[PDB]
Amino acid sequence: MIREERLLKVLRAPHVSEKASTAMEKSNTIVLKVAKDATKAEIKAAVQKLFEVEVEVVNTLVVKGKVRQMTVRSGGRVIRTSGRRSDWKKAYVTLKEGQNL
Amino acid sequence: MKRTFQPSVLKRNRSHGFRARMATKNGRQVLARRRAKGRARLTVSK
Amino acid sequence: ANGEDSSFGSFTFTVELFSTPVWIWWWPRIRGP
RNA sequence: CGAAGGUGUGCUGUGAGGCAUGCUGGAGGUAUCAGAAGUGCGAAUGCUGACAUAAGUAACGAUAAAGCGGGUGAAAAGCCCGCUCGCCGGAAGACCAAGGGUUCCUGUCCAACGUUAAUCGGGGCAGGGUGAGUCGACCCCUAAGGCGAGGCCGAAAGGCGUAGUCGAUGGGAAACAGGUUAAUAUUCCUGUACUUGGUGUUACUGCGAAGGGGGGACGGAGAAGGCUAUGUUGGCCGGGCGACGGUUGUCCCGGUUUAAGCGUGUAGGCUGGUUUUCCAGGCAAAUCCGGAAAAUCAAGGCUGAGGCGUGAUGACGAGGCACUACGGUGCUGAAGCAACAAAUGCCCUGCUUCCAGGAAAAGCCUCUAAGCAUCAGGUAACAUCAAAUCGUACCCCAAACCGACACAGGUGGUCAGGUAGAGAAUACCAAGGCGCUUGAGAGAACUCGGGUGAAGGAACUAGGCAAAAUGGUGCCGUAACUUCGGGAGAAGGCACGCUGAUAUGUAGGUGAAGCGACUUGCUCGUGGAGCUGAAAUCAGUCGAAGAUACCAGCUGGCUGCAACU
RNA sequence: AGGACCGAACCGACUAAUGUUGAAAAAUUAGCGGAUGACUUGUGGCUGGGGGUGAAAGGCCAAUCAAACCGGGAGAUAGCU
RNA sequence: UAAGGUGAUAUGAACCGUUAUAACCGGCGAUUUCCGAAUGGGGAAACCCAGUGUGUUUCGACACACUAUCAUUAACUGAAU
């Protein structure tokens, strides 16, 4: 069985978008950001425990980060820097009949 | 016309990859030289 | 109201220059053989 | 209260040079006499940076093509909307693999990038977007090959290789149809399914291998036959009655779709079946495989498209009825059949034939050994749970890949609609997608790509180079020579359109009802409705011309060389 | 039946023209040859430099080949410019 | 050692501290993902797949430890014989 500390780790944030809002209002589906190494069983247990709702099924995907470019000044001189935003995991959690936040 | 570079990731890794460099002592010497130079990318492995 | 971008993530344009030697045929050019 | 450096002026020495001070500059510089040198530049097709010239010249990258109206805007040939025009259509459409890596969708901006402008963009910035038990990877299995405990070799490094372990481009389980987003869908939703495994309950029970045997499991070519995808026409349903003569009809336009699964098991293909006894074989043993006898029935079994039923009183559906921000959203919804023609797709890993004689291993089925014995295990039914992880956006014959470029090049797989046509050639079209990111004029020489030419017709030229010409199908006819196959489409001729009749559509193809049988339905025989449909002959008829376009052999004679592909 | 015939895909490359600071560091256009085979093609693998591979041309071995490329001996040597 | 701090970018925000347990500096500890000799097997570095124990369990499962090769030594057992 999954320990409670793991469950308190795996849930990162609710994900806000019009796709997420439409999913909630159509299919009773909750979209979250989760830890990149969280399995579907872990997400199911975490939602069922920390949110006190009953979960039907979890769908997950990994989002690759984009390249972001911005400048940093280093000793009276602006230099252009480039780097990639970190990947993250998105969970589509379908609720049986409960209401969430 | 067909040009010389005809990419293929599998062939690239099997020829010049990290595990291919580590398999022989000459390839291990290639890696040591690149570490001594301070190369940001040791191999084609990505 | 619109604001100012002030980014120009393509402002610095790196410029180079390189060429290639060209084969020429000289055989009828010849005043000899 | 103005150093070095920069820039002028004056003076001065034979010269390298020196001194003074106006401006600029804003903090360093150094008499003299010695000392040390990275100590002096015009050249080295010297090296680096900057800037000229040609010159506002060549060019702006396929000759598929554009014209107007409206919109937005500072500004419109290029953006958006509309109407026309043109181009591709076995591709210039659609879907992928490889490769790429956010290029995808929305909002904003126009510096730079875009061979012009740009309000636009594969550009900048911000936000969003990739949902799987069944698709793919991972995973089980192995090929070529790689690595390789021990091992065998080798001055060292190391080489080869056994047990083994990796390695797909190959073999191993299972999902379809509708709907939906600005951007994902066999992944979400709706409906209807399926597979494998674990664990329990019940019932019946011999189970049990790194071992044996089956199976998986395999070439080329050719020829049917049976089908389907798909198409055409008719019927049906809905709509229409014509900007110019006619159009209530052998009239016009559109639609007539529906899957996995489950049930049935037929066109076809293969094979005799079932018992009993025995054993020098399958490294051991076996009830399995192989072999040998005997009896008795060949009337059994495997395999297999398609059709049919159900799935489905559901979904979809022309079009209407509404709202609207005129984007688009919402509601309802007719008919939804038949005949003919059909593949290169399926039956087919089949069948026939040939020689060059056509992977492996696992999953799977089966047999026992050691072993386990009222256990454990196996079989079936039911219940329940589990099917993780990674990929999924977008381009993908290309402006996202390989070519330094938004480059006339290269790049494997799949799908393939109509009319002509042998055809995947070719012409014109559909669905779909585009007009190729500089335009506007002019209408010189010359260059490029083409059209046509009096008379002549190879006189051209190294040479008929290039061009012109020939070109289809059927029939008649066809020499030398020959290795007897050839030569040969030798050469050379003739007939080709349309209309009517034979025959209101023929020969042929398909084939319904009706009827007869049977072993009684996915049956057989007969019958001929309906549909489709060449070719020929006779008669007529128009044009200069009937293989009318595109498409599509020039022919003959004598010789050298090499047999030939 | 066929290293059979005509001819698309596909694989080549005989002739001409254009192009030659190209649309292209070998192409385009019009013709041309093979097109069931000694064929062609995807994906992997193996052979390494006096070595490989070669239906043989000193062909090809990353736009490089009578001895690849990279680094080193190395500031080789240069009675020559 | 301290009246200032929360590294640069850095402004800001929300805060910490002012004799002494804010920050900073030094000694000693703790934690120390994954890859890499990489060592449980494999592999195209940063990934895929396990076996055996111990413990836990809400029966879904979960946590931890160990498991490379070679050399030497020891114990056990043990072919042709």
Curated annotation (Swiss-Prot), chain A:
Which Pfam families does the record match to this protein? Ribosomal_L23
Q: Name one GO cellular component term.
A: cytoplasm
What happens on changing residue 18 to A?
Binds normally to ribosomes; strongly reduces trigger factor binding
Q: Name one GO molecular function term.
A: rRNA binding
What PROSITE patterns does the record tag this protein with?
RIBOSOMAL_L23
Q: Which SUPFAM superfamilies match?
A: Ribosomal proteins S24e, L23 and L15e (SSF54189)
Entry's Gene Ontology BP terms: cytoplasmic translation; ribosomal large subunit assembly
Per the record's keyword annotation, is Ribosomal protein included, yes or no?
Answer: yes
Instruction: Give, from the UniProt record, the effect of changing residue 18 to Q.
Output: Strongly reduces trigger factor binding
Q: Which UniProt keywords apply?
A: Ribonucleoprotein, Ribosomal protein, RNA-binding, rRNA-binding
The family annotation for this protein states: Belongs to the universal ribosomal protein uL23 family.
The cross-references to HAMAP family, in alphabetical order and at most eight, read:
Ribosomal_uL23_B (MF_01369_B)
On subunit structure and binding partners, the annotation says: Part of the 50S ribosomal subunit. Contacts protein L29 and trigger factor. Might also contact SecE and probably does contact SecG and SecY when the SecYEG translocation complex is docked with the ribosome.
What is the role of this chain? Answer: One of the early assembly proteins, it binds 23S rRNA; is essential for growth. One of the proteins that surround the polypeptide exit tunnel on the outside of the subunit. Acts as the docking site for trigger factor for Ffh binding to the ribosome (SRP54) and to nascent polypeptide chains.
Protein name, please?
Answer: Large ribosomal subunit protein uL23
Curated annotation (Swiss-Prot), chain B:
GO BP: any one term: cytoplasmic translation
Q: Gene3D superfamilies annotated for this entry?
A: 1.10.287.3980
- Species this chain originates from: Escherichia coli (strain K12)
Q: What's a Pfam family in this record?
A: Ribosomal_L34
- Please provide the record's keywords in A-Z order: Ribonucleoprotein, Ribosomal protein
Per UniProt, what is the name of the gene that codes for the protein in this document? rpmH
This protein's assembly is summarised as: Part of the 50S ribosomal subunit.
Domain of life, per UniProt, equals Bacteria
Q: Kindly provide the name given to this protein in its UniProt entry.
A: Large ribosomal subunit protein bL34
Q: Does the keyword Ribonucleoprotein apply?
A: yes
Family label: Belongs to the bacterial ribosomal protein bL34 family.
**Gene Ontology cellular-component annotations:** cytoplasm; cytosolic large ribosomal subunit
Q: Which GO terms describe its molecular function?
A: structural constituent of ribosome
Curated annotation (Swiss-Prot), chain C:
Query: What's the superkingdom here?
Result: Eukaryota
Its transmembrane ranges are: none
Q: Which cysteines are joined by disulfide bonds?
A: none
Record note on domains = The rod domain contains six 100-residue motifs that appear to have a cross-beta conformation.
Subunit structure, briefly? Homodimer.
| Protein function | F-actin cross-linking protein.
* Protein name in the entry: Gelation factor
Instruction: List the taxonomic lineage.
Output: Eukaryota, Amoebozoa, Evosea, Eumycetozoa, Dictyostelia
Q: Which residues of the full protein are shown?
A: 751 to 765 of 857
